[PDB]
Amino acid sequence: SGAIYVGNYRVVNRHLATHNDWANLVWEDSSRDLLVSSTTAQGCDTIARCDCQTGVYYCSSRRKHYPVSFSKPSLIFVEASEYYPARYQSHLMLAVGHSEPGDCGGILRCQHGVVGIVSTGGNGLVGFADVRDLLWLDE
Ligand SMILES: CSc1ccccc1N1C[C@@H](C(N)=O)CCC1=O
Ligand SMILES: [Zn+2]
Numbered sequence: 001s002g003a004i005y006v007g008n009y010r011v012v013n014r015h016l017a018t019h020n021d022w023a024n025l026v027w028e029d030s031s032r033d034l035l036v037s038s039t040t041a042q043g044c045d046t047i048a049r050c051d052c053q054t055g056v057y058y059c060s061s062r063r064k065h066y067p068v069s070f071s072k073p074s075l076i077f078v079e080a081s082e083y084y085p086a087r088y089q090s091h092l093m094l095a096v097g098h099s100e101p102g103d104c105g106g107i108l109r110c111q112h113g114v115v116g117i118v119s120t121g122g123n124g125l126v127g128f129a130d131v132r133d134l135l136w137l138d139e
Contacts, residue, residue, distance in 0.1 A: 001104070015033060055108050059103055
């Protein structure tokens with residue numbers, strides 16, 4: 001689990017969105033595994049606006065943060081699960097690291113701010129949904 005809070009927005013993994021997230025829907029993209037809902041309270045997370053390929057992510061299944069190198073956002077094939085059939089997921093970044101289903105929502109951060117959230121895993125890899133292109137999150 002985990003979310004990003006910036007301004008009057010809440011960014012969550014689309015497969016983990018609640019009834020309240022859907023009742024206050026701003027934007028959702030199944031191909032990205034992202035959903036953004038509106039909030040009454042003001043969030044103060046800083047979104048990164050950069051092309052970094054190094055950062056640190058939080059891994060709940062180890063209660064630890066790990067430094068990782070990660071690929072640029074791209075269209076990557078993701079094995080079927082109970083939330084989605086086998087498909088290509090867009091705007092995804094991969095790194096060598098540990099990730100279990102419950103790790104979804106862990107934040108990846110660089111020196112500039114939040115880069116994305118854990119969205120895929122298995123085989124010794126960890127995949128992050130990028131949010132750096134969603135410039136509207138800051139306005
Ligand atoms: C670390 S997430 C993971 C790990 C192992 C096996 C499956 C997953 N996924 C991948 C997710 C997706 N974005 O398609 C769907 C939900 C899920 O549990
Ligand atoms: Zn950066």
